[PDB]
Amino acid sequence: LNVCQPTRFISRHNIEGIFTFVDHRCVATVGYQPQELLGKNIVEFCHPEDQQLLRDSFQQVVKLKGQVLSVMFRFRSKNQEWLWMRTSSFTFQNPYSDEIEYIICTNTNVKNS
Amino acid sequence: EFKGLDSKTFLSEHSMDMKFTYCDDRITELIGYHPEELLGRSAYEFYHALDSENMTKSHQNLCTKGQVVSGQYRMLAKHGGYVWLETQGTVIYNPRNLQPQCIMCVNYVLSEIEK
Ligand SMILES: O=[N+]([O-])c1cc(C(F)(F)F)ccc1NCc1ccco1
Protein backbone atom coordinates (compact mmCIF):
# COMPACT_ATOMS: atom_id res chain seq x y z
CA LEU A 1 0.00 0.00 0.00
CA ASN A 2 1.12 3.54 -0.89
CA VAL A 3 0.99 5.90 2.04
CA CYS A 4 1.70 9.62 2.27
CA GLN A 5 5.42 9.95 3.02
CA PRO A 6 6.25 12.56 5.69
CA THR A 7 8.48 15.30 4.40
CA ARG A 8 11.89 15.02 6.11
CA PHE A 9 15.63 15.39 5.77
CA ILE A 10 18.70 14.35 7.62
CA SER A 11 21.36 16.74 8.88
CA ARG A 12 24.57 16.47 10.93
CA HIS A 13 25.66 19.12 13.43
CA ASN A 14 28.55 19.90 15.66
CA ILE A 15 27.57 20.03 19.38
CA GLU A 16 27.13 23.84 19.20
CA GLY A 17 24.48 23.23 16.46
CA ILE A 18 26.24 24.27 13.25
CA PHE A 19 25.07 22.29 10.18
CA THR A 20 28.01 20.21 8.87
CA PHE A 21 25.97 18.03 6.48
CA VAL A 22 22.51 18.56 5.01
CA ASP A 23 20.59 15.98 2.87
CA HIS A 24 19.10 17.45 -0.36
CA ARG A 25 15.61 16.50 0.79
CA CYS A 26 15.91 19.80 2.69
CA VAL A 27 14.73 21.60 -0.48
CA ALA A 28 11.35 19.80 -0.45
CA THR A 29 11.11 20.09 3.34
CA VAL A 30 12.07 23.69 4.16
CA GLY A 31 12.90 25.20 0.67
CA TYR A 32 16.61 25.86 1.25
CA GLN A 33 19.43 24.46 -0.77
CA PRO A 34 21.88 22.53 1.42
CA GLN A 35 24.61 25.14 1.01
CA GLU A 36 22.21 27.77 2.43
CA LEU A 37 22.18 25.84 5.74
CA LEU A 38 25.73 24.45 5.84
CA GLY A 39 27.93 26.45 8.20
CA LYS A 40 25.03 28.10 9.96
CA ASN A 41 23.61 27.26 13.39
CA ILE A 42 20.19 25.62 13.29
CA VAL A 43 19.08 28.02 16.10
CA GLU A 44 19.28 30.86 13.44
CA PHE A 45 16.31 29.22 11.69
CA CYS A 46 14.38 28.65 14.96
CA HIS A 47 11.42 30.77 16.17
CA PRO A 48 12.49 33.15 18.94
CA GLU A 49 10.08 31.55 21.39
CA ASP A 50 11.64 28.13 20.74
CA GLN A 51 15.38 29.04 20.63
CA GLN A 52 16.08 28.24 24.31
CA LEU A 53 14.27 24.92 24.05
CA LEU A 54 16.34 24.05 20.99
CA ARG A 55 19.67 25.09 22.56
CA ASP A 56 18.67 23.03 25.62
CA SER A 57 18.08 20.04 23.32
CA PHE A 58 21.74 20.12 22.16
CA GLN A 59 23.00 19.82 25.68
CA GLN A 60 20.47 17.12 26.48
CA VAL A 61 21.35 15.07 23.44
CA VAL A 62 25.05 15.09 24.44
CA LYS A 63 24.10 13.95 27.97
CA LEU A 64 22.20 11.07 26.40
CA LYS A 65 25.50 9.65 25.08
CA GLY A 66 24.00 8.16 21.94
CA GLN A 67 20.32 7.87 22.86
CA VAL A 68 17.59 9.65 20.78
CA LEU A 69 16.08 13.01 21.86
CA SER A 70 12.95 14.41 20.12
CA VAL A 71 12.14 18.15 20.10
CA MET A 72 9.34 20.03 18.32
CA PHE A 73 9.99 23.61 17.24
CA ARG A 74 9.12 26.17 14.55
CA PHE A 75 11.60 26.44 11.67
CA ARG A 76 11.63 29.40 9.29
CA SER A 77 11.20 28.11 5.79
CA LYS A 78 12.78 29.71 2.69
CA ASN A 79 9.42 31.34 2.05
CA GLN A 80 9.51 32.99 5.55
CA GLU A 81 6.80 30.82 7.05
CA TRP A 82 7.05 29.02 10.41
CA LEU A 83 6.90 25.23 9.86
CA TRP A 84 6.49 22.80 12.75
CA MET A 85 9.57 20.57 12.76
CA ARG A 86 10.05 17.45 14.87
CA THR A 87 13.80 16.82 15.12
CA SER A 88 14.99 13.48 16.41
CA SER A 89 18.65 13.49 17.23
CA PHE A 90 21.45 11.48 18.74
CA THR A 91 25.21 11.72 19.14
CA PHE A 92 27.71 9.53 17.34
CA GLN A 93 31.44 8.83 17.52
CA ASN A 94 33.10 6.06 15.45
CA PRO A 95 33.70 3.46 18.20
CA TYR A 96 37.29 2.86 17.01
CA SER A 97 38.03 6.47 17.80
CA ASP A 98 37.83 9.21 20.35
CA GLU A 99 37.05 12.05 17.92
CA ILE A 100 34.51 14.63 19.26
CA GLU A 101 31.00 13.33 18.91
CA TYR A 102 28.69 14.94 16.40
CA ILE A 103 24.89 14.99 16.29
CA ILE A 104 22.78 13.21 13.65
CA CYS A 105 19.29 14.70 13.17
CA THR A 106 16.19 13.57 11.32
CA ASN A 107 14.00 16.65 10.69
CA THR A 108 10.33 16.09 9.78
CA ASN A 109 7.64 18.69 9.03
CA VAL A 110 4.74 17.58 11.28
CA LYS A 111 1.33 18.92 12.40
CA ASN A 112 1.16 20.70 15.76
CA SER A 113 -0.52 23.60 17.57
CA GLU B 1 44.78 3.20 0.98
CA PHE B 2 44.46 4.56 4.57
CA LYS B 3 41.37 6.72 4.79
CA GLY B 4 40.18 9.17 7.35
CA LEU B 5 37.06 8.36 9.74
CA ASP B 6 34.71 10.67 7.84
CA SER B 7 35.39 8.87 4.58
CA LYS B 8 34.67 5.42 6.05
CA THR B 9 31.15 6.11 7.29
CA PHE B 10 27.97 6.49 5.32
CA LEU B 11 24.50 7.40 6.62
CA SER B 12 21.39 5.60 5.34
CA GLU B 13 17.69 5.91 6.07
CA HIS B 14 15.25 3.07 5.66
CA SER B 15 11.56 2.53 5.90
CA MET B 16 10.59 0.10 8.66
CA ASP B 17 10.86 -2.93 6.21
CA MET B 18 14.55 -2.02 5.59
CA LYS B 19 14.02 -0.50 2.08
CA PHE B 20 16.46 2.38 1.47
CA THR B 21 14.85 5.82 1.53
CA TYR B 22 18.12 7.77 1.55
CA CYS B 23 21.86 7.06 1.35
CA ASP B 24 24.75 9.49 1.40
CA ASP B 25 27.26 9.77 -1.38
CA ARG B 26 30.14 8.47 0.73
CA ILE B 27 29.01 4.92 -0.16
CA THR B 28 30.29 5.36 -3.73
CA GLU B 29 33.99 5.44 -2.97
CA LEU B 30 33.66 2.68 -0.35
CA ILE B 31 31.73 0.19 -2.39
CA GLY B 32 30.74 1.39 -5.69
CA TYR B 33 27.02 2.15 -5.53
CA HIS B 34 25.43 5.44 -6.32
CA PRO B 35 22.64 6.31 -3.81
CA GLU B 36 20.09 6.73 -6.66
CA GLU B 37 20.43 3.06 -7.53
CA LEU B 38 19.81 1.91 -3.94
CA LEU B 39 16.52 3.79 -3.37
CA GLY B 40 13.49 1.56 -2.98
CA ARG B 41 15.56 -1.61 -2.68
CA SER B 42 15.73 -3.81 0.33
CA ALA B 43 18.77 -3.80 2.60
CA TYR B 44 18.74 -7.60 2.12
CA GLU B 45 19.85 -7.24 -1.50
CA PHE B 46 23.20 -6.04 -0.23
CA TYR B 47 23.73 -8.42 2.68
CA HIS B 48 26.16 -11.25 2.00
CA ALA B 49 24.45 -14.67 1.86
CA LEU B 50 26.26 -15.81 5.02
CA ASP B 51 25.01 -12.89 7.11
CA SER B 52 21.42 -12.49 5.81
CA GLU B 53 19.83 -14.51 8.62
CA ASN B 54 21.91 -12.74 11.31
CA MET B 55 20.77 -9.41 9.90
CA THR B 56 17.16 -10.52 10.27
CA LYS B 57 17.86 -11.10 13.93
CA SER B 58 19.56 -7.73 14.46
CA HIS B 59 16.61 -6.05 12.72
CA GLN B 60 14.26 -7.73 15.28
CA ASN B 61 16.35 -6.45 18.11
CA LEU B 62 16.44 -2.99 16.57
CA CYS B 63 12.62 -2.86 16.43
CA THR B 64 12.13 -3.99 20.06
CA LYS B 65 14.85 -2.04 21.70
CA GLY B 66 14.79 0.97 19.38
CA GLN B 67 18.58 0.86 18.73
CA VAL B 68 21.04 -1.89 17.85
CA VAL B 69 24.66 -2.39 16.99
CA SER B 70 24.95 -5.02 14.30
CA GLY B 71 27.58 -7.74 14.43
CA GLN B 72 30.37 -7.53 11.88
CA TYR B 73 28.77 -8.32 8.56
CA ARG B 74 29.50 -8.19 4.84
CA MET B 75 27.93 -5.82 2.39
CA LEU B 76 28.08 -6.88 -1.27
CA ALA B 77 30.10 -4.43 -3.33
CA LYS B 78 28.85 -3.06 -6.73
CA HIS B 79 31.41 -4.96 -8.85
CA GLY B 80 31.63 -8.13 -6.80
CA GLY B 81 33.19 -9.11 -3.50
CA TYR B 82 32.15 -7.40 -0.27
CA VAL B 83 33.32 -5.09 2.48
CA TRP B 84 33.08 -5.83 6.18
CA LEU B 85 30.78 -3.33 7.91
CA GLU B 86 29.26 -2.55 11.28
CA THR B 87 26.08 -0.53 11.62
CA GLN B 88 24.51 1.37 14.49
CA GLY B 89 20.74 1.47 13.83
CA THR B 90 18.23 3.85 15.50
CA VAL B 91 14.43 3.78 15.12
CA ILE B 92 12.86 7.22 14.78
CA TYR B 93 9.47 7.44 16.54
CA ASN B 94 6.60 9.79 16.65
CA PRO B 95 6.44 10.71 20.35
CA ARG B 96 2.68 11.54 20.13
CA ASN B 97 1.70 7.92 19.36
CA LEU B 98 5.00 5.91 19.79
CA GLN B 99 4.67 4.73 16.17
CA PRO B 100 7.90 3.96 14.22
CA GLN B 101 8.61 6.30 11.30
CA CYS B 102 11.95 5.08 9.83
CA ILE B 103 15.31 3.59 10.67
CA MET B 104 18.50 5.65 10.77
CA CYS B 105 21.70 3.76 10.12
CA VAL B 106 25.28 4.89 10.73
CA ASN B 107 27.38 2.39 8.67
CA TYR B 108 31.16 2.26 9.06
CA VAL B 109 33.44 0.11 6.96
CA LEU B 110 35.95 -2.31 8.61
CA SER B 111 37.85 -3.56 5.55
CA GLU B 112 38.75 -2.92 1.93
CA ILE B 113 36.81 -4.82 -0.72
CA GLU B 114 37.56 -8.60 -0.36
CA LYS B 115 36.66 -11.60 -2.62
O1 LIG C 1 18.28 -0.84 6.98
N1 LIG C 1 18.46 -1.47 8.16
O2 LIG C 1 17.31 -1.64 8.89
C1 LIG C 1 19.71 -1.88 8.59
C2 LIG C 1 19.77 -2.58 9.81
C3 LIG C 1 21.00 -3.05 10.32
C4 LIG C 1 21.10 -3.77 11.64
F1 LIG C 1 21.83 -4.84 11.65
F2 LIG C 1 19.85 -3.96 12.10
F3 LIG C 1 21.76 -2.99 12.50
C5 LIG C 1 22.15 -2.86 9.58
C6 LIG C 1 22.11 -2.19 8.35
C7 LIG C 1 20.90 -1.65 7.88
N2 LIG C 1 20.84 -0.99 6.70
C8 LIG C 1 22.04 -0.61 5.95
C9 LIG C 1 22.55 -1.61 5.00
C10 LIG C 1 21.71 -2.25 4.11
C11 LIG C 1 22.48 -3.10 3.35
C12 LIG C 1 23.78 -3.03 3.77
O3 LIG C 1 23.88 -1.99 4.83
PDB file of C-alpha atoms and ligand atoms in Angstrom, chain B residues 10 12 14 18 20 43-44 46-47 55 58-59 62 68-70 73 75 85 87-89 103 105 107, ligand 1:
ATOM      1  CA  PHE B  10      27.971   6.492   5.319  1.00  0.00           C
ATOM      2  CA  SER B  12      21.395   5.599   5.344  1.00  0.00           C
ATOM      3  CA  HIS B  14      15.248   3.066   5.660  1.00  0.00           C
ATOM      4  CA  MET B  18      14.548  -2.016   5.592  1.00  0.00           C
ATOM      5  CA  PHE B  20      16.464   2.381   1.473  1.00  0.00           C
ATOM      6  CA  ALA B  43      18.772  -3.797   2.602  1.00  0.00           C
ATOM      7  CA  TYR B  44      18.743  -7.598   2.125  1.00  0.00           C
ATOM      8  CA  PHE B  46      23.204  -6.042  -0.230  1.00  0.00           C
ATOM      9  CA  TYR B  47      23.731  -8.422   2.675  1.00  0.00           C
ATOM     10  CA  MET B  55      20.766  -9.407   9.901  1.00  0.00           C
ATOM     11  CA  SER B  58      19.556  -7.728  14.462  1.00  0.00           C
ATOM     12  CA  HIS B  59      16.608  -6.045  12.722  1.00  0.00           C
ATOM     13  CA  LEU B  62      16.436  -2.992  16.574  1.00  0.00           C
ATOM     14  CA  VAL B  68      21.038  -1.888  17.853  1.00  0.00           C
ATOM     15  CA  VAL B  69      24.664  -2.386  16.992  1.00  0.00           C
ATOM     16  CA  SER B  70      24.950  -5.017  14.302  1.00  0.00           C
ATOM     17  CA  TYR B  73      28.767  -8.325   8.564  1.00  0.00           C
ATOM     18  CA  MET B  75      27.930  -5.818   2.393  1.00  0.00           C
ATOM     19  CA  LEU B  85      30.784  -3.330   7.907  1.00  0.00           C
ATOM     20  CA  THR B  87      26.080  -0.533  11.620  1.00  0.00           C
ATOM     21  CA  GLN B  88      24.510   1.371  14.495  1.00  0.00           C
ATOM     22  CA  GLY B  89      20.740   1.467  13.829  1.00  0.00           C
ATOM     23  CA  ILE B 103      15.306   3.595  10.668  1.00  0.00           C
ATOM     24  CA  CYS B 105      21.696   3.761  10.125  1.00  0.00           C
ATOM     25  CA  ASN B 107      27.375   2.390   8.674  1.00  0.00           C
TER      26      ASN B 107
HETATM   27  O1  LIG C   1      18.277  -0.836   6.979  1.00  0.00           O
HETATM   28  N1  LIG C   1      18.455  -1.465   8.158  1.00  0.00           N
HETATM   29  O2  LIG C   1      17.307  -1.641   8.886  1.00  0.00           O
HETATM   30  C1  LIG C   1      19.706  -1.881   8.588  1.00  0.00           C
HETATM   31  C2  LIG C   1      19.775  -2.578   9.808  1.00  0.00           C
HETATM   32  C3  LIG C   1      20.997  -3.050  10.315  1.00  0.00           C
HETATM   33  C4  LIG C   1      21.102  -3.767  11.644  1.00  0.00           C
HETATM   34  F1  LIG C   1      21.829  -4.840  11.649  1.00  0.00           F
HETATM   35  F2  LIG C   1      19.853  -3.959  12.100  1.00  0.00           F
HETATM   36  F3  LIG C   1      21.759  -2.995  12.500  1.00  0.00           F
HETATM   37  C5  LIG C   1      22.148  -2.861   9.583  1.00  0.00           C
HETATM   38  C6  LIG C   1      22.113  -2.192   8.352  1.00  0.00           C
HETATM   39  C7  LIG C   1      20.898  -1.651   7.882  1.00  0.00           C
HETATM   40  N2  LIG C   1      20.841  -0.993   6.702  1.00  0.00           N
HETATM   41  C8  LIG C   1      22.038  -0.611   5.951  1.00  0.00           C
HETATM   42  C9  LIG C   1      22.553  -1.612   5.001  1.00  0.00           C
HETATM   43  C10 LIG C   1      21.714  -2.254   4.112  1.00  0.00           C
HETATM   44  C11 LIG C   1      22.477  -3.101   3.349  1.00  0.00           C
HETATM   45  C12 LIG C   1      23.781  -3.029   3.773  1.00  0.00           C
HETATM   46  O3  LIG C   1      23.882  -1.991   4.833  1.00  0.00           O
END
